Structure 1
Amino acid sequence: AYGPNVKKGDLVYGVVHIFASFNDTFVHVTDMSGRETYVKVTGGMKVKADRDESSPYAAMMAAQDVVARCKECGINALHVKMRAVGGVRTKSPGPGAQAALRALARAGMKIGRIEDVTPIPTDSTRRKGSRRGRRL
């Protein structure tokens, strides 16, 4: 019913934005301009405890929910953009980034090009904490 008018074997590309912090994981599929979104599932929509929203298992479940529904749209290939929190906070990606990308590949989607798009300042504002840091 839906999907572009193409042959049954052609590839139609989307872009999936994977945001993985230490508190959650986002799996978000848009078109190649970013102005239109197809689906968006987060790790917090799959688990019941706050401490599991960033686990690799929750990211795996979110990705499968994305594939199981975007197949109706007619999208079957994805370019990948991954990011950490960035800015003045940490630049190391969260635990769920690895598991989310692998789940999409094993679910049937083709994988295009991969890039890291973490925000990087050329010079920054001051970050939270004192000059002594977080004393835990």
Structure 2
Amino acid sequence: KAYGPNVKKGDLVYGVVHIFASFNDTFVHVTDMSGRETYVKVTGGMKVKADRDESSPYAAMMAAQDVVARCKECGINALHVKMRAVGGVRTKSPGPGAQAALRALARAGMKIGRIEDVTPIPTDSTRRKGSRRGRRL
């Protein structure tokens, strides 16, 4: 398939994987180092049929394995990691599929570069959803 950069066999060609793991879905998005070009984007909802399971670790692992397949056709063999939670005024805790997706990429044979946490952190914020009494569940 080739479709890759003119480099020596075995050389590390680096992409950036953006892992957005909320509590409803997991995103496995592979771009370049500028972020402008996207080689591939597979989500957990692309892998399951029930809404309740799109955020499951198994769905994230399945989506990560799909990404490694396509990355090989692109020529990308190494990835810098940028993981994020919902952020903003919402929760900053990463979703269940964040750890599963990263582990799946490592086991699938793709080299892991630098890892960073890039959830949007406001230095001050608008009002969060819900009343002053919070979500009454």
Report the CA distance between 1:115 and its aligned residue. 0.3
- Aligned sequence identity (%): 100
Runs of 4+ in 1 over 4 A off after TM superposition: none
Report the CA distance between 1:31 and its aligned residue. 0.4
Unaligned segments of structure 1, at least 5 residues: none
TM-score for both structures, normalised by structure 2: 0.98
> Bigger CA drift: 96-105 or 2-11?
2-11
Deviations 1:31-88 (A, max 9, x none): 0000000000000000010000000000000000000111011100000000000000
Deviations 1:73-116 (A, max 9, x none): 11000000000000000000000000000000000100000000
In structure 2, C-alpha distance between the alignment counterparts of 1:9 and 1:120, rounded to whole Å: 38
Unaligned segments of structure 2, at least 5 residues: none
Deviations 1:7-31 (A, max 9, x none): 1021100000000000000000000
Instruction: Classify the secondary structure of the residue corresponding to 1:105.
Output: helix
Report the CA distance between 1:121 and its aligned residue. 0.6
In structure 2, C-alpha distance between the alignment counterparts of 1:60 and 1:72, rounded to whole Å: 20
Q: Give 1:23's aligned residue.
A: 24
Instruction: Classify the secondary structure of the residue corresponding to 2:68.
Output: helix
Number of equivalences: 136
Q: Give 2:79's aligned residue.
A: 78
In structure 1, C-alpha distance between the alignment counterparts of 2:47 and 2:31, rounded to whole Å: 21
In structure 1, C-alpha distance between the alignment counterparts of 2:110 and 2:55, rounded to whole Å: 23
Instruction: Classify the secondary structure of the residue corresponding to 1:111.
Output: strand
In structure 1, C-alpha distance between the alignment counterparts of 2:39 and 2:51, rounded to whole Å: 26
